[PDB]
From Swiss-Prot, chain A:
This is Nuclear pore complex protein Nup205. Plays a role in the nuclear pore complex (NPC) assembly and/or maintenance. May anchor NUP62 and other nucleoporins, but not NUP153 and TPR, to the NPC. In association with TMEM209, may be involved in nuclear transport of various nuclear proteins in addition to MYC. Expressed in the testis. It comes from Homo sapiens. The lineage of its organism: Eukaryota, Metazoa, Chordata, Craniata, Vertebrata. It is linked to Nephrotic syndrome 13: A form of nephrotic syndrome, a renal disease clinically characterized by severe proteinuria, resulting in complications such as hypoalbuminemia, hyperlipidemia and edema. Kidney biopsies show non-specific histologic changes such as focal segmental glomerulosclerosis and diffuse mesangial proliferation. Some affected individuals have an inherited steroid-resistant form and progress to end-stage renal failure. The chain holds residues 1392 to 1509 of 2012 of the full protein. Disulfide bonds: none annotated. Part of the nuclear pore complex (NPC). Forms a complex with NUP35, NUP93, NUP155 and lamin B. Does not interact with TPR. Interacts with TMEM209 and MYC. Belongs to the NUP186/NUP192/NUP205 family. It is found in: Nucleus membrane; Nucleus, Nuclear pore complex.
Curated annotation (Swiss-Prot), chain B:
This is Nuclear pore complex protein Nup93. Plays a role in the nuclear pore complex (NPC) assembly and/or maintenance. May anchor nucleoporins, but not NUP153 and TPR, to the NPC. During renal development, regulates podocyte migration and proliferation through SMAD4 signaling. It is linked to Nephrotic syndrome 12: A form of nephrotic syndrome, a renal disease clinically characterized by severe proteinuria, resulting in complications such as hypoalbuminemia, hyperlipidemia and edema. Kidney biopsies show non-specific histologic changes such as focal segmental glomerulosclerosis and diffuse mesangial proliferation. Some affected individuals have an inherited steroid-resistant form and progress to end-stage renal failure. NPHS12 inheritance is autosomal recessive. It is found in: Nucleus membrane; Nucleus, Nuclear pore complex; Nucleus envelope. Part of the nuclear pore complex (NPC). Component of the p62 complex, a complex composed of NUP62 and NUP54. Forms a complex with NUP35, NUP155, NUP205 and lamin B; the interaction with NUP35 is direct. Does not interact with TPR. Interacts with SMAD4 and IPO7; translocates SMAD4 to the nucleus through the NPC upon BMP7 stimulation resulting in activation of SMAD4 signaling. (Microbial infection) Interacts with SARS-CoV translation inhibitor nsp1; this interaction may disrupt nuclear pore function. The gene is NUP93. Belongs to the nucleoporin interacting component (NIC) family.
Length: 118, 137
């Protein structure tokens, strides 16, 4: 389980919101770690998987598995808080500096994006 | 709706027959009126026929289809209901154990003595276990 990874994910969000780090270089690292974490959590699965899980829950006929959905929910809560704060930081940042760090931050924004889509 | 769909057969021939079947299948799905359409409660005595059953035939395959879908959505209860009709007794209890199992762990202040997953649990046990029980020990 990438539970241990979860803690790093939290630290990353913390640093970003704080926007400490004179270096965007630092923030690029934070963005990269977050990107992998978001991607890692949902191994490529598509709506079919979600539908199957819901049915199984169907209702807990017996013992269901709803592990991946639960993991996504926890990620999304953490992310929310930290989120408003950090969204501000991530976008402004965007522009400038780092045309570089950019490659990293835009990718982070897009992954995040699916999840927390909605 | 069932009564009207049934007329489709009035044009006797394949194609139309399938169209009828598909229409009914489509009706069951998304209307989700399983009890009315498919049937209900054994008390031994197999199914009490649903409206469609009165018309008859392909009904088992539709049930599996609906039930699996229920599984996607996670509409438990519907799944249990569907599997009962399917007569997959073992499957029913297993889904059932899961449902009762969670809701057991949690925090207290619940469980009126009359209706829900627990009540559901009681229904099935009394119901199946006495009778030639097909489930795993």
């Amino acid at each position: 389980g990438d539970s241990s990874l979860y803690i790093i994910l939290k630290k990353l969000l913390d640093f970003i919101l704080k926007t400490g780090g004179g270096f965007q270089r630092v923030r690029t690292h934070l963005y990269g770690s977050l990107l992998y974490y978001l991607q890692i959590a949902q191994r490529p699965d598509e709506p079919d998987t979600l539908e199957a899980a819901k049915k199984t829950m169907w209702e807990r006929l017996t013992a269901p598995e709803d592990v991946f959905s639960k993991l996504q929910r926890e990620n999304i809560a953490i992310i929310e808080s930290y989120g408003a704060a950090l969204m501000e930081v991530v976008c402004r940042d965007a522009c400038d500096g780092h045309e570089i760090g950019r490659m990293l931050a835009l990718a982070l924004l897009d992954r995040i994006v699916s999840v927390d889509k909605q | 709706a069932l009564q009207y769909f049934y007329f489709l057969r009035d044009e006797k021939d394949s194609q139309g027959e399938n169209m009828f079947l598909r229409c009914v299948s489509e009706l069951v799905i998304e209307s989700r009126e399983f009890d009315m359409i498919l049937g209900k409660l054994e008390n031994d005595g197999s199914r009490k026929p649903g409206v469609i059953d009165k018309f008859t035939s392909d009904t088992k395959p539709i049930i599996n289809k609906v039930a699996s879908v229920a599984e996607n959505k996670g509409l438990f209860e519907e799944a249990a209901k569907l599997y009962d009709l399917a007569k997959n007794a073992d499957k029913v209890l297993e889904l059932m154990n899961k449902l009762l199992s969670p809701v057991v762990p949690q925090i207290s202040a619940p469980q009126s003595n009359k209706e829900r997953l627990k009540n559901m649990a009681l229904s099935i046990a009394e119901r199946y276990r006495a009778q030639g029980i097909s489930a795993n020990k």
